[PDB]
Amino acid sequence: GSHSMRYFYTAMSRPGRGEPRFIAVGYVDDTQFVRFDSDAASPRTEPRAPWIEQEGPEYWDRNTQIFKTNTQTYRESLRNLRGYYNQSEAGSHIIQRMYGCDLGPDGRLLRGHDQSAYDGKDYIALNEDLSSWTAADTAAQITQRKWEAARVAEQLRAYLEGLCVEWLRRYLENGKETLQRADPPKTHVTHHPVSDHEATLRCWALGFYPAEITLTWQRDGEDQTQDTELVETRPAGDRTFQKWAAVVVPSGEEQRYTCHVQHEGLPKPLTLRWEP
Amino acid sequence: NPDIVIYQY
Amino acid sequence: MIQRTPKIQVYSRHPAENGKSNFLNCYVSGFHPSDIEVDLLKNGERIEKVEHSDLSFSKDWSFYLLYYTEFTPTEKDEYACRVNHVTLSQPKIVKWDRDM
Numbered sequence: 001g002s003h004s005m006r007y008f009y010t011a012m013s014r015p016g017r018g019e020p021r022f023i024a025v026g027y028v029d030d031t032q033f034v035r036f037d038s039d040a041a042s043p044r045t046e047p048r049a050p051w052i053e054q055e056g057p058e059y060w061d062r063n064t065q066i067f068k069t070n071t072q073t074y075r076e077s078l079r080n081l082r083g084y085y086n087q088s089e090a091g092s093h094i095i096q097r098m099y100g101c102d103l104g105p106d107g108r109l110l111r112g113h114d115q116s117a118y119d120g121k122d123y124i125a126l127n128e129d130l131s132s133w134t135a136a137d138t139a140a141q142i143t144q145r146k147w148e149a150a151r152v153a154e155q156l157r158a159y160l161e162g163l164c165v166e167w168l169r170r171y172l173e174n175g176k177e178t179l180q181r182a183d184p185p186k187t188h189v190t191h192h193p194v195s196d197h198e199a200t201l202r203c204w205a206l207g208f209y210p211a212e213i214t215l216t217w218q219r220d221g222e223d224q225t226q227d228t229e230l231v232e233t234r235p236a237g238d239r240t241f242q243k244w245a246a247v248v249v250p251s252g253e254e255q256r257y258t259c260h261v262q263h264e265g266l267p268k269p270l271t272l273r274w275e276p
Numbered sequence: 277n278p279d280i281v282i283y284q285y
Numbered sequence: 286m287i288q289r290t291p292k293i294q295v296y297s298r299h300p301a302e303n304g305k306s307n308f309l310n311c312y313v314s315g316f317h318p319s320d321i322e323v324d325l326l327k328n329g330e331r332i333e334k335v336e337h338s339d340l341s342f343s344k345d346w347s348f349y350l351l352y353y354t355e356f357t358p359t360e361k362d363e364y365a366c367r368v369n370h371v372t373l374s375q376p377k378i379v380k381w382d383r384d385m
Contacts, residue, residue, distance in 0.1 A: 077285035120287030
């Protein structure tokens, strides 16, 4: 599983246009709680969720030192990777990092993660065993040799099993009312004529949290995946999410179609039809 | 809270 | 180098109701690299006050951003979101449709 914490780092070079930008954001499930941007007026770590604002100056100062050290480290790493790939000095490149812990319903660690990408492609990732690496190509094997010599994986296992779970459990308690309460979707089916012979049936899910959800259309109990337009789950802007699924149906056959909804906040799945 | 495992690639 | 086209959705925070204050959202996702230009439009012209979320990305490494502004839906006014990205030969405009 029911909870997780993730940090997302993005480092972007911009030759001829200044120093590389480093941004870090932190999430508990689908709630962002922290941000750091090296391009800010006076780069420092900022709160982004009410339940983190109570943390003292020691917390923000330690985070700022970690993110400032990372800013310099990713600038050097971008230069290293440009060389490993024999790339021109003219182009912009990006290193991304995503890491964190996943806790089951019992509050116990299910899985630890630490993944990196270069220009949108998997580069190096810590394996499930929390001790070995998967390096996607010859360049990433150079980073693998450095990280094995530095014993990076042992340090990451200690973080993921220890401080990551400790801090995730602390945030989950300080924000119990907004993080542990699953808001069930508000659902409804709308109908929109396409012509005199067809209509769109759109099944809506609004104001739900967490973002994970399944919306499907069936015709006489048969899945309509090929004929369904399913939009990506999108943020409403108030920490809740939205999603819809639509099917074009012959006019007069709407009763044969059902929308199926599965979400954490719904103990049993829903079956909805258009109700004129 | 983020980790302090900071190494160049 | 991987480059991915942005997916664009234009919608309101709350169900549209003419004359009632709401928020107009333009959600761009699934793109790479991160530089992207997003304009919220009111009758074909740029909206002055527009805010945006912090740059983050999904499990597949693609970026996403939310651009948002306060608005009041009316019968006469048309809204849209205009997006440009290195993967697009020209800007892509998606009109706001209250039924989507």
